[model samples]
Target chain A: MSQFTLYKNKDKSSAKTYPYFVDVQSDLLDNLNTRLVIPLTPIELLDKKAPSHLCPTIHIDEGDFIMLTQQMTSVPVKILSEPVNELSTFRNEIIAAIDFLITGI
Target chain B: MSQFTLYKNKDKSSAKTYPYFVDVQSDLLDNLNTRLVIPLTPIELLDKKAPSHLCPTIHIDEGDFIMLTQQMTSVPVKILSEPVNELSTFRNEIIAAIDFLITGI
Candidate 1:
């Protein structure tokens, strides 16, 4: 988690939203002027959650499903938690989402 | 849209379901939220739409969009519609895309 720092949000004080976030500062540095970050959301947040669960998805745990948003955000490094790198397992998926957001391919 | 006080969610069979939400709770805060969320997917729903709109691209205009899932969501954010900030202008299309991400409305 040192580099990856897969952390869930612990603050709900009006600014800290979402459940999960990843530090993409290494890859998305230039793109992120304000401590660039990527947010992870639960699959259950969708309208057709089940079908969404069935489609191309990221499996955080054995079945703990989550989604990645195109919304690149910035935050202080002191606010992340559960730091880990094995989260890199989903690196490819993140890139694909970025690709779709920019090129729609 | 003073502080972006919007709370749109629909449900009949289910409890109160919200495809779109707001965060005035975090308004006036200093960089604590996210933006531009997206879900990774097999392009399942969009591909099933109509040839006029769902062929090779995803429809995000006129609510020609899809909901998010844990599998593919990137998770952006919402806040601020007034006070006429400089950065806020660029965020309009981003949220529209977010609104499109989970609620075709």
Candidate 2:
């Protein structure tokens, strides 16, 4: 993979699924069918109010989510396109989520 | 909608769009064409780097994206499903993202 970093799914094509993705893989892998990644999507899908305490509803550039889903993983490279924005201010939260997920505390 | 909260697209069927969503509007709105949602997905799609400083690889329970997407918006209610897990630790990031989206700094 390219490396672990924040990337916007700039592929604003009408036929896209997610808005953002995190590169979890090292820039030392063979590009093939997959890349180690974790997708960051909307909180609206919850169909209910996300606990203001758990999900923060962060920002994706001008877009609003307030928080990145800690549910990191991988996906195909072909789906994501463009370089819309970067994940800032929210980085610490991202790390915290990972810590909680891996440690289960 | 029910209220703001975290939910997983339990509709893990082969047919699905986003994995999570947030409730942005008041529960009094008339449920109609859309339900406001932004999708979070694999970070691998970024194809490049996502400044680890900006994006932190968080965790979604046993799953990983290690972070959720703050690109909040809405979608159809049908696309969403039941409660999967409530975002506990990442709440702050979610808030920051949304704040950035709304305030933009």
Candidate 3:
């Protein structure tokens, strides 16, 4: 299992609970409808005693796309499975989507 | 109130004042500029006593689009109040914009 980590800014605050970790592995990628398991551990919600915030590192197979589940809950967040090289192609696509959302034209 | 958490990777580092948290709700989404209250209690910037990193939980209303403010600062960050079905049409337009940003054609 290849180990990778997603960073969260501790000093940064949110109106919701800690975001959920999402592991988008190739196995799951192939099945777009699959609901993968989320690994959650009990941690304080901005407990003053535990100041520094950090997300645990996860182990997954190579060639997988991972994102926080809570991040996509609202505002219509979707994952497009493609290589990083092709991100440039999708960058403008994403911006345009945002533009249309702001301006109905 | 629906409770959700945004996971933060402890090991990761950022160059800012502990990024800000953003909650985008349809109610607030309608306001577009309504600043929601953020709950933050600090402990340490970089301490050795704590090892495990955890983000505090938060309470929010349903049908809300909650996003971390830290994620969008200098970059182009905007949200549209439109349905998801229309996203496809905007995708092409975004690519065209970036194409203009990098290559003026």
Candidate 4:
């Protein structure tokens, strides 16, 4: 349960459109029972490009997905399935998107 | 800003509907450039009562505002004006709402 770990969406209803959730909560707060996550939408679902800083694109499981920073939310750890992938490689873009979402700069 | 500190929305376009934003990010992460916040909508703007856990009603500036946890996002510290109020008095409800948002418990 480290930051940047991608988990399969456990909710059945929203799983199709948002198949994954990337945990963005920092490691310093690892004691918390919940995690802050931003849902990932498959690139195929997007109709147009969004600002890279707000919705950075990332590769996962051989598919490209957009990190929807605007929809960031918290979820119970139990709601996410076992971790599937880790995204440390996209650390810069991921952190940039979060910074952009908050500061708009 | 400390957690639960209510700040006036600096974004003019959405200020009317969301007049305030409560900074929910833990103080431990205060060094970051951005702070996580959930926009607050005037109670008058709501159609009906939402789940108390998801959208806790709070009193601010002699008015009632609902913390829209579902729309939580990050924002530049500069986008938020000076502190308008501190909600540490409502700390239980405030922390409960955030816990509910993430863990749904």
The lDDT of each candidate is 0.36, 0.44, 0.23, 0.62
- Put the candidates in lDDT order, highest first: 4, 2, 1, 3
Clash pairs (backbone) in predicted model 4: A74-B102, A75-B102, A76-B102, A102-B74, A102-B75, A102-B76, A103-B76
Poorest lDDT segment (10 consecutive residues) of candidate 1 chain B: B7-16
* Model 3 Cα shift for residue B98 (angstroms): 20
The docking quality of candidate 1, as DockQ, is 0.09
At residue B67, give the lDDT of candidate 4. 73
lDDT per residue (tens digit) for residues B10-60 in model 2: 474411445565433322331433333324443554323555432434466
Lowest lDDT sum, 10 consecutive residues, model 2 chain B, at B24-33
Candidates 2 and 3 compared by TM-score, better number: 2
Off by over 4 Å in 2: A1-5, A14-17, A25-27, A30-35, A45-48, A52-56, A66-71, B1-105
What DockQ number belongs to candidate 4?
A: 0.14
Q: Over the stretch B1-105, how does candidate 1's per-residue lDDT look in tens digits?
A: 222322222221111222332221112221345323322112343344433211122333222323222122223233321111122232443344433332233
Winner by lDDT:
4
Q: What is the i-RMS of every prediction? A: 12.7, 13.6, 12.2, 8.1
lDDT of 1 by residue, A25-57 (tens): 333332232233456656565433455311235
List the candidate 3 regions with Cα displacement exceeding 4 Å.
Answer: A1-84, A100-105, B1-22, B25-68, B72-105
Question: For all the predictions, what are the DockQ values?
Answer: 0.09, 0.03, 0.04, 0.14
1 against 3, candidate with superior lDDT: 1
For candidate 4, the chain B TM-score comes to 0.78
Identify the candidate with maximal DockQ.
4
Candidate 1 docking classification: incorrect
